[PDB]
């Protein structure tokens, strides 16, 4: 699955994931790309706050979905 993550400046991160990856796994991928610590990352998809222990499939996140990093 390819997904996009937008940083707080609008920078686009492109990630390769599996549909059952957890949000904790996605945060580690964001950390490797950008230096952002997982405990400062808050991710939103379609106005839903994503929880670390849940999976992308739990949120119906699909090919080319865009997640946002937020305060
Ligand atoms: Cl997985
Ligand atoms: Cl895993």
mmCIF file of C-alpha atoms and ligand atoms in Angstrom:
data_model
loop_
_atom_site.group_PDB
_atom_site.id
_atom_site.type_symbol
_atom_site.label_atom_id
_atom_site.label_comp_id
_atom_site.label_asym_id
_atom_site.label_seq_id
_atom_site.Cartn_x
_atom_site.Cartn_y
_atom_site.Cartn_z
ATOM 1 C CA UNK A 1 0.000 0.000 0.000
ATOM 2 C CA UNK A 2 1.406 3.474 -0.753
ATOM 3 C CA UNK A 3 0.126 6.260 1.507
ATOM 4 C CA UNK A 4 1.054 9.914 1.906
ATOM 5 C CA UNK A 5 1.695 11.836 5.083
ATOM 6 C CA UNK A 6 1.637 15.606 5.162
ATOM 7 C CA UNK A 7 3.794 17.340 7.782
ATOM 8 C CA UNK A 8 2.798 20.521 9.617
ATOM 9 C CA UNK A 9 4.524 22.532 6.805
ATOM 10 C CA UNK A 10 2.660 20.615 4.058
ATOM 11 C CA UNK A 11 5.764 18.562 3.096
ATOM 12 C CA UNK A 12 4.637 15.262 1.529
ATOM 13 C CA UNK A 13 6.139 12.008 2.914
ATOM 14 C CA UNK A 14 5.451 8.877 0.787
ATOM 15 C CA UNK A 15 5.370 5.580 2.749
ATOM 16 C CA UNK A 16 5.157 1.940 1.805
ATOM 17 C CA UNK A 17 3.006 0.010 4.263
ATOM 18 C CA UNK A 18 0.841 -3.137 4.583
ATOM 19 C CA UNK A 19 -2.900 -2.704 5.111
ATOM 20 C CA UNK A 20 -2.650 -4.121 8.663
ATOM 21 C CA UNK A 21 0.316 -1.976 9.734
ATOM 22 C CA UNK A 22 -0.304 -0.317 13.018
ATOM 23 C CA UNK A 23 -0.187 3.467 13.444
ATOM 24 C CA UNK A 24 2.841 2.837 15.712
ATOM 25 C CA UNK A 25 4.590 1.216 12.706
ATOM 26 C CA UNK A 26 3.649 4.232 10.531
ATOM 27 C CA UNK A 27 5.040 6.677 13.150
ATOM 28 C CA UNK A 28 8.417 4.777 13.040
ATOM 29 C CA UNK A 29 8.476 5.173 9.252
ATOM 30 C CA UNK A 30 7.767 8.929 9.616
ATOM 31 C CA UNK A 31 10.515 9.201 12.230
ATOM 32 C CA UNK A 32 13.025 7.566 9.885
ATOM 33 C CA UNK A 33 12.122 9.887 7.012
ATOM 34 C CA UNK A 34 11.939 13.173 8.900
ATOM 35 C CA UNK A 35 13.390 13.062 12.447
ATOM 36 C CA UNK A 36 9.979 13.616 14.094
ATOM 37 C CA UNK A 37 9.695 11.705 17.415
ATOM 38 C CA UNK A 38 6.718 9.296 17.542
ATOM 39 C CA UNK A 39 5.468 10.735 20.859
ATOM 40 C CA UNK A 40 5.065 14.131 19.145
ATOM 41 C CA UNK A 41 3.225 12.723 16.133
ATOM 42 C CA UNK A 42 -0.601 13.081 16.052
ATOM 43 C CA UNK A 43 -2.050 11.662 12.861
ATOM 44 C CA UNK A 44 -5.503 12.376 11.308
ATOM 45 C CA UNK A 45 -7.218 10.651 8.354
ATOM 46 C CA UNK A 46 -10.519 12.076 7.081
ATOM 47 C CA UNK A 47 -11.049 13.966 10.387
ATOM 48 C CA UNK A 48 -10.413 10.857 12.521
ATOM 49 C CA UNK A 49 -7.609 10.822 15.134
ATOM 50 C CA UNK A 50 -5.551 7.660 14.620
ATOM 51 C CA UNK A 51 -4.532 5.597 17.628
ATOM 52 C CA UNK A 52 -1.065 3.967 17.894
ATOM 53 C CA UNK A 53 -2.333 0.411 18.616
ATOM 54 C CA UNK A 54 -4.877 0.304 15.793
ATOM 55 C CA UNK A 55 -4.241 -0.596 12.143
ATOM 56 C CA UNK A 56 -4.623 1.291 8.849
ATOM 57 C CA UNK A 57 -7.381 -1.202 7.868
ATOM 58 C CA UNK A 58 -9.267 -0.334 11.100
ATOM 59 C CA UNK A 59 -9.640 3.193 9.644
ATOM 60 C CA UNK A 60 -10.402 2.162 6.079
ATOM 61 C CA UNK A 61 -7.146 3.731 4.862
ATOM 62 C CA UNK A 62 -6.482 2.640 1.244
ATOM 63 C CA UNK A 63 -4.134 3.176 -1.714
ATOM 64 C CA UNK A 64 -2.985 6.815 -1.909
ATOM 65 C CA UNK A 65 -4.878 7.934 1.186
ATOM 66 C CA UNK A 66 -3.353 11.069 2.782
ATOM 67 C CA UNK A 67 -2.731 11.286 6.532
ATOM 68 C CA UNK A 68 -2.000 14.612 8.242
ATOM 69 C CA UNK A 69 0.370 15.360 11.102
ATOM 70 C CA UNK A 70 -1.315 17.870 13.428
ATOM 71 C CA UNK A 71 -0.703 19.607 16.771
HETATM 72 CL CL1 LIG B 1 1.429 -5.525 9.393
HETATM 73 CL CL1 LIG B 2 4.110 -5.691 12.385
#
